[PDB]
Design a protein around this ligand. Structure first.
Ligand SMILES: Cc1nc(Nc2ncc(C(=O)Nc3c(C)cccc3Cl)s2)cc(N2CCN(CCO)CC2)n1
Length: 263
């Protein structure tokens, strides 16, 4: 048996403002208050006006997939509204928005241990997804959300410079190509949201990677963290660490913080 999205009575939802817009539709912030339970802030996603039946189905599919996941580092689904129009997907509200934006607005503001904690959370969520045979395909800081307590959660259920060479060249997407992407996310985090490969063109990036180029340590990045990035970017996908190993390695760095001394 599979999980599913719970139906939420529309009277329990109060939409407060629009906080994002896309080609798919839009996202709002609001409040959810169910009888007997404390009010929580939520995010509310809707389809573009005039959506078709097919679009409505593909939409309620993002919800059914999300309903399968219950982990502290994966965005939490509250439920759906389907008995009323328009259709909506409701999740927890992540107060600090996307990780890329958040770090760029807070350049230099966190400690190494805080940053490593964020990476450990992302890794834990990815271990959970990969455990379940899911492949994200689009792992990047822009697709991670952050709450008030700095907890990072995987969201978003070809970006060339986040994508493993075998996924670009042979369309082979696996957890191991997600691990490559995770390495890029590590670099984004430790650089406070710099653009991977800077001004290099997509073509230049592809050629450089094939010739053995890998990104350098971000400014003031511990060597141990950069070495882990390099492990994630092994050419042969089978040579990359698994997500469980990544999390274990981060846990060991956090437990033995002197290991973060060398830069
Ligand atoms: C675009 C945006 N989202 C934020 N938080 C979100 N939490 C959950 C989100 C989400 O999309 N859920 C979701 C849904 C609903 C359906 C399917 C799949 C998913 Cl994953 S979006 C915060 C934010 N900020 C704006 C700027 N800042 C200043 C403050 O006023 C900080 C806050 N902006």
């Amino acid at each position: 048996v599979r999980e599913f999205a719970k139906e939420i009575d529309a009277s329990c939802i109060k939409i407060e403002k629009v906080i994002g817009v896309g080609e798919f539709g839009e996202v709002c912030s609001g409040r959810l208050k169910v009888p007997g339970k404390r009010e929580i802030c939520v995010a509310i996603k809707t389809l573009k006006a005039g959506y078709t039946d097919k679009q409505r189905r593909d939409f309620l599919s993002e919800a059914s997939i999300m309903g399968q996941f219950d982990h502290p580092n994966i965005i939490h689904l509250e439920g759906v509204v389907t008995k009323c129009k328009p259709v909506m997907i409701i999740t927890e509200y992540m107060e600090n928005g996307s990780l890329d934006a958040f770090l760029r607005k807070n350049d230099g503001r966190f400690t190494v241990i805080q940053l490593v904690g964020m990476l450990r959370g992302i890794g834990s969520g990815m271990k959970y997804l990969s455990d379940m045979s899911y492949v994200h395909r689009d792992l990047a800081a822009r697709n991670i959300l952050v709450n008030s307590n700095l907890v990072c959660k995987v969201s978003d259920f070809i970006p060339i410079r986040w994508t493993a060479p075998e996924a670009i060249a042979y369309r082979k997407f696996t957890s191991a190509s997600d691990v490559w992407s995770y390495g890029i996310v590590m670099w984004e985090v430790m650089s406070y949201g710099e653009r991977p490969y800077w001004d290099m063109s997509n073509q230049d990036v592809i050629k450089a990677i094939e010739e053995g180029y890998r990104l350098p340590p971000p400014m003031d990045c511990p060597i141990a963290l950069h070495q882990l990035m390099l492990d994630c970017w092994q050419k042969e996908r089978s040579d990359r660490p698994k997500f469980g190993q990544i999390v274990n390695m981060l846990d060991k760095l956090i437990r033995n913080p002197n290991s973060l001394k060398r830069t």
